[PDB]
Ligand binder design. Structure first.
Ligand code: HEM
Length: 117
Protein backbone atom coordinates (compact mmCIF):
# COMPACT_ATOMS: atom_id res chain seq x y z
CA UNK A 1 0.00 0.00 0.00
CA UNK A 2 2.07 2.98 -1.20
CA UNK A 3 1.32 6.56 0.04
CA UNK A 4 0.03 7.21 -3.46
CA UNK A 5 -2.56 4.40 -3.13
CA UNK A 6 -3.41 5.56 0.42
CA UNK A 7 -4.14 9.12 -0.96
CA UNK A 8 -6.59 7.71 -3.53
CA UNK A 9 -4.34 7.03 -6.48
CA UNK A 10 -4.40 8.76 -9.85
CA UNK A 11 -7.76 10.56 -9.52
CA UNK A 12 -6.71 11.92 -6.11
CA UNK A 13 -3.33 13.16 -7.37
CA UNK A 14 -4.98 14.85 -10.39
CA UNK A 15 -7.35 16.72 -8.03
CA UNK A 16 -4.65 17.49 -5.40
CA UNK A 17 -2.11 19.29 -7.63
CA UNK A 18 -4.50 22.00 -9.01
CA UNK A 19 -6.00 22.48 -5.56
CA UNK A 20 -2.53 22.84 -4.11
CA UNK A 21 -1.70 25.44 -6.80
CA UNK A 22 -4.95 27.32 -6.06
CA UNK A 23 -3.63 27.68 -2.49
CA UNK A 24 0.00 28.37 -3.50
CA UNK A 25 -1.09 31.06 -5.99
CA UNK A 26 -3.01 32.80 -3.16
CA UNK A 27 -0.14 32.52 -0.65
CA UNK A 28 1.85 35.76 -0.33
CA UNK A 29 4.95 33.84 0.66
CA UNK A 30 5.29 32.04 -2.63
CA UNK A 31 2.71 32.92 -5.29
CA UNK A 32 4.96 35.36 -7.13
CA UNK A 33 7.60 32.69 -8.01
CA UNK A 34 5.10 31.38 -10.55
CA UNK A 35 4.38 34.67 -12.28
CA UNK A 36 5.99 33.58 -15.60
CA UNK A 37 5.22 29.88 -15.27
CA UNK A 38 3.09 27.95 -17.71
CA UNK A 39 0.78 26.44 -15.05
CA UNK A 40 -0.61 23.66 -17.27
CA UNK A 41 2.94 22.48 -17.83
CA UNK A 42 3.89 22.85 -14.19
CA UNK A 43 0.79 21.01 -13.03
CA UNK A 44 1.65 18.10 -15.32
CA UNK A 45 5.33 17.89 -14.27
CA UNK A 46 4.53 18.19 -10.60
CA UNK A 47 1.74 15.61 -10.79
CA UNK A 48 4.28 13.23 -12.45
CA UNK A 49 6.92 14.11 -9.84
CA UNK A 50 4.74 13.64 -6.75
CA UNK A 51 3.16 10.47 -8.24
CA UNK A 52 6.65 9.03 -8.65
CA UNK A 53 7.88 10.21 -5.21
CA UNK A 54 4.86 8.79 -3.39
CA UNK A 55 5.09 5.34 -4.93
CA UNK A 56 2.81 5.57 -7.93
CA UNK A 57 3.87 4.99 -11.56
CA UNK A 58 7.21 6.60 -12.42
CA UNK A 59 6.78 8.71 -15.55
CA UNK A 60 8.61 11.81 -14.28
CA UNK A 61 10.95 13.11 -17.04
CA UNK A 62 11.71 16.58 -15.70
CA UNK A 63 14.52 18.30 -13.95
CA UNK A 64 16.02 17.24 -10.64
CA UNK A 65 15.07 19.50 -7.69
CA UNK A 66 18.35 21.44 -7.77
CA UNK A 67 18.10 22.21 -11.53
CA UNK A 68 14.31 22.90 -11.22
CA UNK A 69 14.94 25.73 -8.68
CA UNK A 70 18.33 26.89 -9.91
CA UNK A 71 18.82 30.66 -9.65
CA UNK A 72 15.81 31.19 -7.33
CA UNK A 73 17.88 31.14 -4.02
CA UNK A 74 14.84 29.74 -2.28
CA UNK A 75 14.65 30.20 1.51
CA UNK A 76 13.35 27.98 4.25
CA UNK A 77 10.14 29.91 4.64
CA UNK A 78 9.28 29.19 1.00
CA UNK A 79 9.63 25.43 1.44
CA UNK A 80 7.58 25.54 4.64
CA UNK A 81 4.82 27.34 2.77
CA UNK A 82 4.79 24.67 0.05
CA UNK A 83 4.52 21.85 2.64
CA UNK A 84 1.81 23.69 4.56
CA UNK A 85 -0.21 24.21 1.37
CA UNK A 86 0.22 20.57 0.26
CA UNK A 87 -0.85 19.37 3.73
CA UNK A 88 -3.89 21.72 3.76
CA UNK A 89 -4.80 20.41 0.23
CA UNK A 90 -4.66 16.76 1.26
CA UNK A 91 -6.66 17.52 4.48
CA UNK A 92 -9.35 19.32 2.40
CA UNK A 93 -9.46 16.26 0.14
CA UNK A 94 -10.22 14.02 3.19
CA UNK A 95 -6.77 12.37 3.63
CA UNK A 96 -6.03 11.31 7.29
CA UNK A 97 -3.33 13.18 9.31
CA UNK A 98 -1.25 9.94 9.40
CA UNK A 99 -1.07 9.68 5.61
CA UNK A 100 -0.46 13.38 5.17
CA UNK A 101 2.51 13.04 7.54
CA UNK A 102 3.94 10.07 5.61
CA UNK A 103 3.71 12.07 2.41
CA UNK A 104 5.29 15.21 3.94
CA UNK A 105 8.15 13.13 5.43
CA UNK A 106 9.07 11.84 1.92
CA UNK A 107 8.84 15.29 0.29
CA UNK A 108 10.73 16.94 3.17
CA UNK A 109 14.00 15.12 2.05
CA UNK A 110 14.01 17.39 -1.10
CA UNK A 111 14.44 20.58 1.00
CA UNK A 112 18.27 20.56 0.90
CA UNK A 113 18.27 19.97 -2.85
CA UNK A 114 16.32 23.18 -3.73
CA UNK A 115 17.13 25.74 -1.04
CA UNK A 116 19.73 28.38 -1.88
CA UNK A 117 20.28 27.28 -5.49
C1 HEM B 1 10.38 25.81 -1.96
C2 HEM B 1 9.35 26.47 -2.47
C3 HEM B 1 9.17 26.21 -3.97
C4 HEM B 1 8.95 27.17 -4.89
C5 HEM B 1 8.83 28.67 -4.64
C6 HEM B 1 8.91 26.45 -6.15
C7 HEM B 1 8.78 27.15 -7.38
C8 HEM B 1 9.00 26.54 -8.62
C9 HEM B 1 9.03 27.23 -9.89
C10 HEM B 1 8.77 28.74 -9.95
C11 HEM B 1 9.33 26.37 -10.84
C12 HEM B 1 9.37 26.61 -12.40
C13 HEM B 1 10.31 27.57 -13.16
C14 HEM B 1 9.46 27.59 -14.57
O1 HEM B 1 9.57 26.58 -15.35
O2 HEM B 1 8.40 28.31 -14.74
C15 HEM B 1 9.44 25.03 -10.23
C16 HEM B 1 9.73 23.85 -10.90
C17 HEM B 1 9.44 22.61 -10.27
N1 HEM B 1 9.20 22.47 -8.89
FE1 HEM B 1 9.16 23.79 -7.50
N2 HEM B 1 9.08 25.05 -6.13
C18 HEM B 1 9.18 24.97 -4.69
C19 HEM B 1 9.22 23.70 -4.04
C20 HEM B 1 9.03 22.49 -4.73
C21 HEM B 1 8.79 21.22 -4.10
C22 HEM B 1 8.72 21.00 -2.53
C23 HEM B 1 8.62 20.35 -5.12
C24 HEM B 1 8.28 18.81 -5.07
C25 HEM B 1 8.43 18.12 -3.94
C26 HEM B 1 8.73 21.03 -6.37
C27 HEM B 1 8.66 20.40 -7.63
C28 HEM B 1 8.94 21.08 -8.82
C29 HEM B 1 8.91 20.40 -10.09
C30 HEM B 1 8.63 18.93 -10.45
C31 HEM B 1 9.25 21.43 -11.04
C32 HEM B 1 9.34 21.27 -12.54
C33 HEM B 1 10.65 20.82 -13.03
C34 HEM B 1 10.54 20.56 -14.55
O3 HEM B 1 9.72 21.31 -15.24
O4 HEM B 1 11.40 19.88 -15.10
N3 HEM B 1 9.00 22.36 -6.09
N4 HEM B 1 9.24 25.22 -8.87
Amino acid sequence: QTIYEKLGGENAMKAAVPLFYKKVLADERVKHFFKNTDMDHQTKQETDFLTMLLGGPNHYKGKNMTEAHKGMNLQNLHFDAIIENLAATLKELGVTDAVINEAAKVIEHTRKDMLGK
